[PDB]
């Protein structure tokens, strides 16, 4: 039985809300987790961002363009962008983008609990987590972290996200114009 | 591409210094640019109580950009300011002058 749903309290400052799960979860299970106990609305688009797994760089105007684009796009459709989760790769640039606007919006962070810096203290429920095995992007309020047991590989998040993307595109909650929230992979 | 930062940087490793000894050095240098680029990092930990004592130092020396990085990063003033620290702030002699006496 699972034991962590805390928050990050890094000393800027920003809270979060997450849960450790396993690869053996249903996507409709995580759906009512997202809509009820997480109390989250449905998006009108899913901005699934994948990237170079190692921490890369962009040209400065690419950085500003990607930042302003993701921020302004998220505002128009009022949506939640699936990402990886750790402060590495494209996900670091996504957190820098969220710092570039920093006004109001939330982005979901499907990643492994298997790879997490200081796994043990974040078992603490709703407890301060001042992130100083990689730390998760501090600018993320939502990051589902699948504890598949095994520690230090990149697993239980390629499949999990895969299902949750297909499921949230297919299940069609709310208004469901077209068929569910249309999903676009940036 | 610049000797300025290179000379200052070579002293950051050359001091054989952890992050508080680095930052107290930059604070006396009035150089917060080298603080943001090397001394402040992403992932490792600073010793407990070093971040707060640096403020007793940064406020009394009028290091206004060091204030912007030392506390607004990771020291809340809702978790720093007490009776004894504000008293030591009112009884400094460092920094600029005052008509207070």
PDB file of C-alpha atoms in Angstrom:
ATOM      1  CA  UNK A   1       0.000   0.000   0.000  1.00  0.00           C
ATOM      2  CA  UNK A   2       1.269   3.395  -1.104  1.00  0.00           C
ATOM      3  CA  UNK A   3       2.562   6.056   1.290  1.00  0.00           C
ATOM      4  CA  UNK A   4       3.425   9.466  -0.274  1.00  0.00           C
ATOM      5  CA  UNK A   5       1.345  12.329  -1.610  1.00  0.00           C
ATOM      6  CA  UNK A   6       3.346  15.299  -0.333  1.00  0.00           C
ATOM      7  CA  UNK A   7       4.329  18.738  -1.578  1.00  0.00           C
ATOM      8  CA  UNK A   8       7.545  20.455  -2.519  1.00  0.00           C
ATOM      9  CA  UNK A   9       8.563  23.467  -0.462  1.00  0.00           C
ATOM     10  CA  UNK A  10      11.986  24.353  -1.866  1.00  0.00           C
ATOM     11  CA  UNK A  11      13.946  27.075  -0.106  1.00  0.00           C
ATOM     12  CA  UNK A  12      11.692  31.344  -5.146  1.00  0.00           C
ATOM     13  CA  UNK A  13       8.884  29.251  -3.650  1.00  0.00           C
ATOM     14  CA  UNK A  14       6.054  27.186  -5.133  1.00  0.00           C
ATOM     15  CA  UNK A  15       3.913  24.364  -3.768  1.00  0.00           C
ATOM     16  CA  UNK A  16       2.874  21.144  -5.529  1.00  0.00           C
ATOM     17  CA  UNK A  17       0.691  18.051  -5.212  1.00  0.00           C
ATOM     18  CA  UNK A  18       1.557  14.548  -6.348  1.00  0.00           C
ATOM     19  CA  UNK A  19       1.327  10.869  -5.374  1.00  0.00           C
ATOM     20  CA  UNK A  20       3.569   7.826  -5.662  1.00  0.00           C
ATOM     21  CA  UNK A  21       1.853   5.034  -7.662  1.00  0.00           C
ATOM     22  CA  UNK A  22       3.077   1.990  -9.584  1.00  0.00           C
ATOM     23  CA  UNK A  23       3.074   0.915 -13.225  1.00  0.00           C
ATOM     24  CA  UNK A  24       0.202  -1.364 -12.102  1.00  0.00           C
ATOM     25  CA  UNK A  25      -2.357   1.436 -12.063  1.00  0.00           C
ATOM     26  CA  UNK A  26      -5.271   2.002 -14.370  1.00  0.00           C
ATOM     27  CA  UNK A  27      -5.479   5.227 -16.398  1.00  0.00           C
ATOM     28  CA  UNK A  28      -9.125   5.682 -15.372  1.00  0.00           C
ATOM     29  CA  UNK A  29      -7.918   5.160 -11.800  1.00  0.00           C
ATOM     30  CA  UNK A  30      -5.454   8.028 -12.266  1.00  0.00           C
ATOM     31  CA  UNK A  31      -8.241   9.901 -14.071  1.00  0.00           C
ATOM     32  CA  UNK A  32     -10.542  10.076 -11.062  1.00  0.00           C
ATOM     33  CA  UNK A  33      -7.482  10.735  -8.900  1.00  0.00           C
ATOM     34  CA  UNK A  34      -6.822  13.749 -11.145  1.00  0.00           C
ATOM     35  CA  UNK A  35     -10.411  14.978 -11.214  1.00  0.00           C
ATOM     36  CA  UNK A  36     -11.612  14.340  -7.631  1.00  0.00           C
ATOM     37  CA  UNK A  37      -8.903  14.137  -4.948  1.00  0.00           C
ATOM     38  CA  UNK A  38      -6.636  16.372  -6.990  1.00  0.00           C
ATOM     39  CA  UNK A  39      -9.749  18.443  -7.859  1.00  0.00           C
ATOM     40  CA  UNK A  40      -8.574  19.345 -11.417  1.00  0.00           C
ATOM     41  CA  UNK A  41     -10.637  20.430 -14.490  1.00  0.00           C
ATOM     42  CA  UNK A  42     -10.283  18.694 -17.893  1.00  0.00           C
ATOM     43  CA  UNK A  43      -8.009  20.363 -20.467  1.00  0.00           C
ATOM     44  CA  UNK A  44      -9.075  21.311 -23.953  1.00  0.00           C
ATOM     45  CA  UNK A  45      -5.665  20.125 -25.294  1.00  0.00           C
ATOM     46  CA  UNK A  46      -2.827  17.921 -23.947  1.00  0.00           C
ATOM     47  CA  UNK A  47       0.614  19.492 -24.737  1.00  0.00           C
ATOM     48  CA  UNK A  48       2.721  16.282 -24.394  1.00  0.00           C
ATOM     49  CA  UNK A  49       6.304  17.619 -24.369  1.00  0.00           C
ATOM     50  CA  UNK A  50       9.160  15.152 -24.780  1.00  0.00           C
ATOM     51  CA  UNK A  51      12.724  16.144 -25.492  1.00  0.00           C
ATOM     52  CA  UNK A  52      16.393  15.328 -25.296  1.00  0.00           C
ATOM     53  CA  UNK A  53      16.824  13.295 -22.125  1.00  0.00           C
ATOM     54  CA  UNK A  54      20.181  14.860 -21.265  1.00  0.00           C
ATOM     55  CA  UNK A  55      20.154  18.564 -20.429  1.00  0.00           C
ATOM     56  CA  UNK A  56      20.511  20.387 -23.737  1.00  0.00           C
ATOM     57  CA  UNK A  57      20.555  24.031 -24.783  1.00  0.00           C
ATOM     58  CA  UNK A  58      18.682  26.213 -27.245  1.00  0.00           C
ATOM     59  CA  UNK A  59      19.461  29.497 -28.952  1.00  0.00           C
ATOM     60  CA  UNK A  60      18.291  32.513 -26.843  1.00  0.00           C
ATOM     61  CA  UNK A  61      15.379  33.451 -29.083  1.00  0.00           C
ATOM     62  CA  UNK A  62      14.393  29.763 -29.262  1.00  0.00           C
ATOM     63  CA  UNK A  63      14.358  29.792 -25.446  1.00  0.00           C
ATOM     64  CA  UNK A  64      12.189  32.921 -25.312  1.00  0.00           C
ATOM     65  CA  UNK A  65       9.948  31.696 -28.159  1.00  0.00           C
ATOM     66  CA  UNK A  66       9.416  28.246 -26.608  1.00  0.00           C
ATOM     67  CA  UNK A  67       8.758  29.889 -23.237  1.00  0.00           C
ATOM     68  CA  UNK A  68       6.288  32.530 -24.394  1.00  0.00           C
ATOM     69  CA  UNK A  69       4.666  29.989 -26.712  1.00  0.00           C
ATOM     70  CA  UNK A  70       4.048  27.337 -24.061  1.00  0.00           C
ATOM     71  CA  UNK A  71       2.910  29.962 -21.520  1.00  0.00           C
ATOM     72  CA  UNK A  72       0.514  31.801 -23.847  1.00  0.00           C
ATOM     73  CA  UNK A  73      -0.766  28.547 -25.390  1.00  0.00           C
ATOM     74  CA  UNK A  74      -1.445  27.011 -21.952  1.00  0.00           C
ATOM     75  CA  UNK A  75      -3.451  30.170 -21.063  1.00  0.00           C
ATOM     76  CA  UNK A  76      -5.638  30.153 -24.233  1.00  0.00           C
ATOM     77  CA  UNK A  77      -6.718  26.508 -23.984  1.00  0.00           C
ATOM     78  CA  UNK A  78      -6.437  26.490 -20.161  1.00  0.00           C
ATOM     79  CA  UNK A  79      -4.629  23.194 -20.123  1.00  0.00           C
ATOM     80  CA  UNK A  80      -2.211  20.759 -18.514  1.00  0.00           C
ATOM     81  CA  UNK A  81       0.963  19.799 -20.358  1.00  0.00           C
ATOM     82  CA  UNK A  82       2.325  16.312 -19.812  1.00  0.00           C
ATOM     83  CA  UNK A  83       6.124  16.312 -19.370  1.00  0.00           C
ATOM     84  CA  UNK A  84       8.848  14.128 -17.870  1.00  0.00           C
ATOM     85  CA  UNK A  85       9.446  15.514 -14.362  1.00  0.00           C
ATOM     86  CA  UNK A  86      13.068  15.776 -13.202  1.00  0.00           C
ATOM     87  CA  UNK A  87      15.025  19.035 -13.527  1.00  0.00           C
ATOM     88  CA  UNK A  88      16.907  17.718 -16.592  1.00  0.00           C
ATOM     89  CA  UNK A  89      16.525  17.934 -20.360  1.00  0.00           C
ATOM     90  CA  UNK A  90      13.477  19.548 -21.935  1.00  0.00           C
ATOM     91  CA  UNK A  91      11.842  19.552 -18.509  1.00  0.00           C
ATOM     92  CA  UNK A  92      14.374  22.062 -17.136  1.00  0.00           C
ATOM     93  CA  UNK A  93      13.543  24.384 -20.043  1.00  0.00           C
ATOM     94  CA  UNK A  94       9.818  23.888 -19.348  1.00  0.00           C
ATOM     95  CA  UNK A  95      10.349  24.934 -15.727  1.00  0.00           C
ATOM     96  CA  UNK A  96      12.365  27.937 -16.914  1.00  0.00           C
ATOM     97  CA  UNK A  97       9.423  28.814 -19.182  1.00  0.00           C
ATOM     98  CA  UNK A  98       6.995  28.616 -16.274  1.00  0.00           C
ATOM     99  CA  UNK A  99       9.382  30.894 -14.388  1.00  0.00           C
ATOM    100  CA  UNK A 100       9.429  33.280 -17.364  1.00  0.00           C
ATOM    101  CA  UNK A 101       5.734  34.036 -17.015  1.00  0.00           C
ATOM    102  CA  UNK A 102       5.164  33.199 -13.273  1.00  0.00           C
ATOM    103  CA  UNK A 103       1.838  35.035 -12.920  1.00  0.00           C
ATOM    104  CA  UNK A 104      -1.187  32.764 -12.468  1.00  0.00           C
ATOM    105  CA  UNK A 105      -1.367  27.208 -15.736  1.00  0.00           C
ATOM    106  CA  UNK A 106      -0.516  23.956 -14.072  1.00  0.00           C
ATOM    107  CA  UNK A 107       1.504  21.266 -15.888  1.00  0.00           C
ATOM    108  CA  UNK A 108       1.370  17.526 -15.173  1.00  0.00           C
ATOM    109  CA  UNK A 109       4.634  15.687 -14.580  1.00  0.00           C
ATOM    110  CA  UNK A 110       4.513  11.927 -15.394  1.00  0.00           C
ATOM    111  CA  UNK A 111       7.932  10.636 -14.304  1.00  0.00           C
ATOM    112  CA  UNK A 112       9.313   7.833 -12.106  1.00  0.00           C
ATOM    113  CA  UNK A 113       9.379   7.749  -8.331  1.00  0.00           C
ATOM    114  CA  UNK A 114      12.147   5.201  -9.009  1.00  0.00           C
ATOM    115  CA  UNK A 115      14.462   8.077  -9.914  1.00  0.00           C
ATOM    116  CA  UNK A 116      14.112  10.780  -7.246  1.00  0.00           C
ATOM    117  CA  UNK A 117      16.681  12.627  -5.156  1.00  0.00           C
ATOM    118  CA  UNK A 118      15.867  12.078  -1.456  1.00  0.00           C
ATOM    119  CA  UNK A 119      13.168   9.432  -1.904  1.00  0.00           C
ATOM    120  CA  UNK A 120      12.881   8.841   1.838  1.00  0.00           C
ATOM    121  CA  UNK A 121      11.893  12.274   3.160  1.00  0.00           C
ATOM    122  CA  UNK A 122       9.254  12.811   0.454  1.00  0.00           C
ATOM    123  CA  UNK A 123       7.406   9.776   1.793  1.00  0.00           C
ATOM    124  CA  UNK A 124       6.358  12.411   4.374  1.00  0.00           C
ATOM    125  CA  UNK A 125       2.723  13.290   3.762  1.00  0.00           C
ATOM    126  CA  UNK A 126       2.044  16.967   2.847  1.00  0.00           C
ATOM    127  CA  UNK A 127       5.428  17.726   4.376  1.00  0.00           C
ATOM    128  CA  UNK A 128       7.911  20.527   3.539  1.00  0.00           C
ATOM    129  CA  UNK A 129      10.304  19.365   0.748  1.00  0.00           C
ATOM    130  CA  UNK A 130      13.034  22.079   0.095  1.00  0.00           C
ATOM    131  CA  UNK A 131      14.706  20.274  -2.853  1.00  0.00           C
ATOM    132  CA  UNK A 132      18.195  21.778  -2.519  1.00  0.00           C
ATOM    133  CA  UNK A 133      18.317  10.177  -8.429  1.00  0.00           C
ATOM    134  CA  UNK A 134      17.375  13.674  -9.575  1.00  0.00           C
ATOM    135  CA  UNK A 135      15.134  16.316  -7.959  1.00  0.00           C
ATOM    136  CA  UNK A 136      11.819  16.895  -9.773  1.00  0.00           C
ATOM    137  CA  UNK A 137      11.291  20.235 -11.626  1.00  0.00           C
ATOM    138  CA  UNK A 138      10.461  22.625  -8.720  1.00  0.00           C
ATOM    139  CA  UNK A 139       8.195  24.742 -11.015  1.00  0.00           C
ATOM    140  CA  UNK A 140       5.780  21.760 -11.456  1.00  0.00           C
ATOM    141  CA  UNK A 141       2.636  21.675  -9.236  1.00  0.00           C
ATOM    142  CA  UNK A 142       1.500  18.291 -10.616  1.00  0.00           C
ATOM    143  CA  UNK A 143       3.984  15.387 -11.011  1.00  0.00           C
ATOM    144  CA  UNK A 144       2.770  11.779 -10.864  1.00  0.00           C
ATOM    145  CA  UNK A 145       5.761   9.624  -9.884  1.00  0.00           C
ATOM    146  CA  UNK A 146       5.383   5.887 -10.433  1.00  0.00           C
ATOM    147  CA  UNK A 147       7.149   3.770  -7.797  1.00  0.00           C
ATOM    148  CA  UNK A 148       7.675   0.569  -9.756  1.00  0.00           C
ATOM    149  CA  UNK A 149       9.975  -0.497  -6.927  1.00  0.00           C
ATOM    150  CA  UNK A 150      13.176  -0.369  -8.946  1.00  0.00           C
ATOM    151  CA  UNK A 151      15.410   2.595  -8.207  1.00  0.00           C
ATOM    152  CA  UNK A 152      17.520   4.510 -10.695  1.00  0.00           C
ATOM    153  CA  UNK A 153      16.211   3.397 -14.068  1.00  0.00           C
ATOM    154  CA  UNK A 154      13.858   5.205 -16.452  1.00  0.00           C
ATOM    155  CA  UNK A 155      10.725   3.093 -16.210  1.00  0.00           C
ATOM    156  CA  UNK A 156       7.006   3.080 -15.281  1.00  0.00           C
ATOM    157  CA  UNK A 157       6.571   6.437 -16.983  1.00  0.00           C
ATOM    158  CA  UNK A 158       6.924   5.636 -20.677  1.00  0.00           C
ATOM    159  CA  UNK A 159       4.041   3.161 -20.407  1.00  0.00           C
ATOM    160  CA  UNK A 160       2.058   5.138 -17.792  1.00  0.00           C
ATOM    161  CA  UNK A 161       2.061   8.412 -19.808  1.00  0.00           C
ATOM    162  CA  UNK A 162       1.406   6.359 -22.996  1.00  0.00           C
ATOM    163  CA  UNK A 163      -1.822   4.968 -21.430  1.00  0.00           C
ATOM    164  CA  UNK A 164      -2.859   8.248 -19.745  1.00  0.00           C
ATOM    165  CA  UNK A 165      -2.471  10.096 -23.064  1.00  0.00           C
ATOM    166  CA  UNK A 166      -4.552   7.544 -24.997  1.00  0.00           C
ATOM    167  CA  UNK A 167      -7.057   7.328 -22.159  1.00  0.00           C
ATOM    168  CA  UNK A 168      -7.553  11.067 -21.625  1.00  0.00           C
ATOM    169  CA  UNK A 169      -7.911  11.491 -25.395  1.00  0.00           C
ATOM    170  CA  UNK A 170     -10.458   8.650 -25.567  1.00  0.00           C
ATOM    171  CA  UNK A 171     -12.516   8.916 -22.339  1.00  0.00           C
ATOM    172  CA  UNK A 172     -14.073  12.287 -23.302  1.00  0.00           C
ATOM    173  CA  UNK A 173     -15.092  13.932 -20.019  1.00  0.00           C
ATOM    174  CA  UNK A 174     -16.932  17.274 -19.750  1.00  0.00           C
ATOM    175  CA  UNK A 175     -17.927  19.019 -22.990  1.00  0.00           C
ATOM    176  CA  UNK A 176     -15.751  16.637 -25.136  1.00  0.00           C
ATOM    177  CA  UNK A 177     -15.811  18.711 -28.339  1.00  0.00           C
ATOM    178  CA  UNK A 178     -14.690  16.415 -31.125  1.00  0.00           C
ATOM    179  CA  UNK A 179     -13.661  13.431 -29.027  1.00  0.00           C
ATOM    180  CA  UNK A 180     -12.180  14.403 -25.673  1.00  0.00           C
ATOM    181  CA  UNK A 181      -9.299  16.827 -25.319  1.00  0.00           C
ATOM    182  CA  UNK A 182      -7.277  16.555 -28.559  1.00  0.00           C
ATOM    183  CA  UNK A 183      -3.679  15.617 -27.811  1.00  0.00           C
ATOM    184  CA  UNK A 184      -0.725  17.223 -29.620  1.00  0.00           C
ATOM    185  CA  UNK A 185       2.862  16.086 -29.050  1.00  0.00           C
ATOM    186  CA  UNK A 186       5.326  18.987 -29.084  1.00  0.00           C
TER     187      UNK A 186
ATOM    188  CA  UNK B   1      36.212  35.320 -22.904  1.00  0.00           C
ATOM    189  CA  UNK B   2      36.721  37.730 -19.924  1.00  0.00           C
ATOM    190  CA  UNK B   3      39.667  37.812 -17.439  1.00  0.00           C
ATOM    191  CA  UNK B   4      37.509  39.719 -14.869  1.00  0.00           C
ATOM    192  CA  UNK B   5      35.226  36.729 -14.100  1.00  0.00           C
ATOM    193  CA  UNK B   6      38.090  34.248 -14.797  1.00  0.00           C
ATOM    194  CA  UNK B   7      40.304  35.876 -12.091  1.00  0.00           C
ATOM    195  CA  UNK B   8      37.356  36.034  -9.614  1.00  0.00           C
ATOM    196  CA  UNK B   9      36.322  32.443 -10.535  1.00  0.00           C
ATOM    197  CA  UNK B  10      39.862  31.108 -10.108  1.00  0.00           C
ATOM    198  CA  UNK B  11      39.667  32.459  -6.553  1.00  0.00           C
ATOM    199  CA  UNK B  12      36.360  30.679  -5.928  1.00  0.00           C
ATOM    200  CA  UNK B  13      37.989  27.280  -6.333  1.00  0.00           C
ATOM    201  CA  UNK B  14      41.252  28.770  -5.052  1.00  0.00           C
ATOM    202  CA  UNK B  15      39.772  29.645  -1.659  1.00  0.00           C
ATOM    203  CA  UNK B  16      39.095  25.891  -1.096  1.00  0.00           C
ATOM    204  CA  UNK B  17      35.734  27.145   0.058  1.00  0.00           C
ATOM    205  CA  UNK B  18      32.270  25.776   0.577  1.00  0.00           C
ATOM    206  CA  UNK B  19      29.288  27.898  -0.561  1.00  0.00           C
ATOM    207  CA  UNK B  20      29.130  30.157   2.603  1.00  0.00           C
ATOM    208  CA  UNK B  21      32.851  30.987   2.521  1.00  0.00           C
ATOM    209  CA  UNK B  22      32.427  31.680  -1.202  1.00  0.00           C
ATOM    210  CA  UNK B  23      29.449  33.977  -0.643  1.00  0.00           C
ATOM    211  CA  UNK B  24      30.908  35.955   2.272  1.00  0.00           C
ATOM    212  CA  UNK B  25      33.926  36.529  -0.006  1.00  0.00           C
ATOM    213  CA  UNK B  26      31.720  37.813  -2.888  1.00  0.00           C
ATOM    214  CA  UNK B  27      29.747  39.956  -0.421  1.00  0.00           C
ATOM    215  CA  UNK B  28      32.922  41.771   0.620  1.00  0.00           C
ATOM    216  CA  UNK B  29      33.733  42.070  -3.093  1.00  0.00           C
ATOM    217  CA  UNK B  30      30.262  43.634  -3.759  1.00  0.00           C
ATOM    218  CA  UNK B  31      30.120  41.237  -6.726  1.00  0.00           C
ATOM    219  CA  UNK B  32      26.785  39.437  -6.871  1.00  0.00           C
ATOM    220  CA  UNK B  33      27.220  38.382 -10.515  1.00  0.00           C
ATOM    221  CA  UNK B  34      29.839  35.769  -9.593  1.00  0.00           C
ATOM    222  CA  UNK B  35      27.557  34.658  -6.759  1.00  0.00           C
ATOM    223  CA  UNK B  36      24.612  33.893  -9.052  1.00  0.00           C
ATOM    224  CA  UNK B  37      26.779  32.102 -11.622  1.00  0.00           C
ATOM    225  CA  UNK B  38      29.055  29.849  -9.530  1.00  0.00           C
ATOM    226  CA  UNK B  39      28.321  30.019  -5.789  1.00  0.00           C
ATOM    227  CA  UNK B  40      24.583  29.390  -6.182  1.00  0.00           C
ATOM    228  CA  UNK B  41      24.063  26.033  -7.880  1.00  0.00           C
ATOM    229  CA  UNK B  42      21.350  23.491  -8.701  1.00  0.00           C
ATOM    230  CA  UNK B  43      21.226  20.427  -6.477  1.00  0.00           C
ATOM    231  CA  UNK B  44      23.807  20.455  -3.681  1.00  0.00           C
ATOM    232  CA  UNK B  45      23.272  21.689  -0.132  1.00  0.00           C
ATOM    233  CA  UNK B  46      24.512  24.620   1.918  1.00  0.00           C
ATOM    234  CA  UNK B  47      25.261  24.109   5.661  1.00  0.00           C
ATOM    235  CA  UNK B  48      22.461  24.976   8.085  1.00  0.00           C
ATOM    236  CA  UNK B  49      22.554  28.498   9.515  1.00  0.00           C
ATOM    237  CA  UNK B  50      25.054  29.875   6.996  1.00  0.00           C
ATOM    238  CA  UNK B  51      22.352  31.406   4.786  1.00  0.00           C
ATOM    239  CA  UNK B  52      20.870  33.393   7.696  1.00  0.00           C
ATOM    240  CA  UNK B  53      24.079  34.699   9.273  1.00  0.00           C
ATOM    241  CA  UNK B  54      25.090  35.983   5.824  1.00  0.00           C
ATOM    242  CA  UNK B  55      22.022  38.280   6.086  1.00  0.00           C
ATOM    243  CA  UNK B  56      23.064  39.822   9.385  1.00  0.00           C
ATOM    244  CA  UNK B  57      26.111  40.674   7.237  1.00  0.00           C
ATOM    245  CA  UNK B  58      24.403  41.629   3.956  1.00  0.00           C
ATOM    246  CA  UNK B  59      21.855  44.036   5.424  1.00  0.00           C
ATOM    247  CA  UNK B  60      24.361  45.945   7.579  1.00  0.00           C
ATOM    248  CA  UNK B  61      26.704  46.430   4.589  1.00  0.00           C
ATOM    249  CA  UNK B  62      23.872  47.685   2.282  1.00  0.00           C
ATOM    250  CA  UNK B  63      24.314  44.868  -0.264  1.00  0.00           C
ATOM    251  CA  UNK B  64      20.955  45.379  -1.955  1.00  0.00           C
ATOM    252  CA  UNK B  65      21.438  42.834  -4.750  1.00  0.00           C
ATOM    253  CA  UNK B  66      22.886  40.310  -2.306  1.00  0.00           C
ATOM    254  CA  UNK B  67      19.642  40.731  -0.356  1.00  0.00           C
ATOM    255  CA  UNK B  68      17.662  39.935  -3.520  1.00  0.00           C
ATOM    256  CA  UNK B  69      19.523  36.607  -3.939  1.00  0.00           C
ATOM    257  CA  UNK B  70      20.387  35.602  -0.318  1.00  0.00           C
ATOM    258  CA  UNK B  71      16.771  35.629   1.014  1.00  0.00           C
ATOM    259  CA  UNK B  72      14.336  35.743  -1.918  1.00  0.00           C
ATOM    260  CA  UNK B  73      15.880  32.479  -3.090  1.00  0.00           C
ATOM    261  CA  UNK B  74      15.788  30.535   0.172  1.00  0.00           C
ATOM    262  CA  UNK B  75      15.528  32.511   3.432  1.00  0.00           C
ATOM    263  CA  UNK B  76      12.053  33.808   4.276  1.00  0.00           C
ATOM    264  CA  UNK B  77      12.063  37.045   6.263  1.00  0.00           C
ATOM    265  CA  UNK B  78       9.054  35.443   7.916  1.00  0.00           C
ATOM    266  CA  UNK B  79      11.649  32.843   9.029  1.00  0.00           C
ATOM    267  CA  UNK B  80      14.611  35.211   9.595  1.00  0.00           C
ATOM    268  CA  UNK B  81      13.628  38.394  11.449  1.00  0.00           C
ATOM    269  CA  UNK B  82      13.577  38.189  15.253  1.00  0.00           C
ATOM    270  CA  UNK B  83      13.981  40.618  18.164  1.00  0.00           C
ATOM    271  CA  UNK B  84      17.697  39.920  18.579  1.00  0.00           C
ATOM    272  CA  UNK B  85      18.528  40.129  14.871  1.00  0.00           C
ATOM    273  CA  UNK B  86      16.621  43.389  14.335  1.00  0.00           C
ATOM    274  CA  UNK B  87      18.369  44.778  17.420  1.00  0.00           C
ATOM    275  CA  UNK B  88      21.769  43.874  15.951  1.00  0.00           C
ATOM    276  CA  UNK B  89      20.616  45.550  12.734  1.00  0.00           C
ATOM    277  CA  UNK B  90      19.793  48.738  14.639  1.00  0.00           C
ATOM    278  CA  UNK B  91      23.171  48.646  16.451  1.00  0.00           C
ATOM    279  CA  UNK B  92      25.514  48.203  13.517  1.00  0.00           C
ATOM    280  CA  UNK B  93      28.164  50.718  12.576  1.00  0.00           C
ATOM    281  CA  UNK B  94      28.932  49.300   9.105  1.00  0.00           C
ATOM    282  CA  UNK B  95      27.536  50.513   5.789  1.00  0.00           C
ATOM    283  CA  UNK B  96      26.477  54.113   5.184  1.00  0.00           C
ATOM    284  CA  UNK B  97      25.970  56.860   7.751  1.00  0.00           C
ATOM    285  CA  UNK B  98      22.823  57.695   9.708  1.00  0.00           C
ATOM    286  CA  UNK B  99      21.202  60.459  11.739  1.00  0.00           C
ATOM    287  CA  UNK B 100      19.956  57.750  14.146  1.00  0.00           C
ATOM    288  CA  UNK B 101      22.399  58.445  17.000  1.00  0.00           C
TER     289      UNK B 101
END
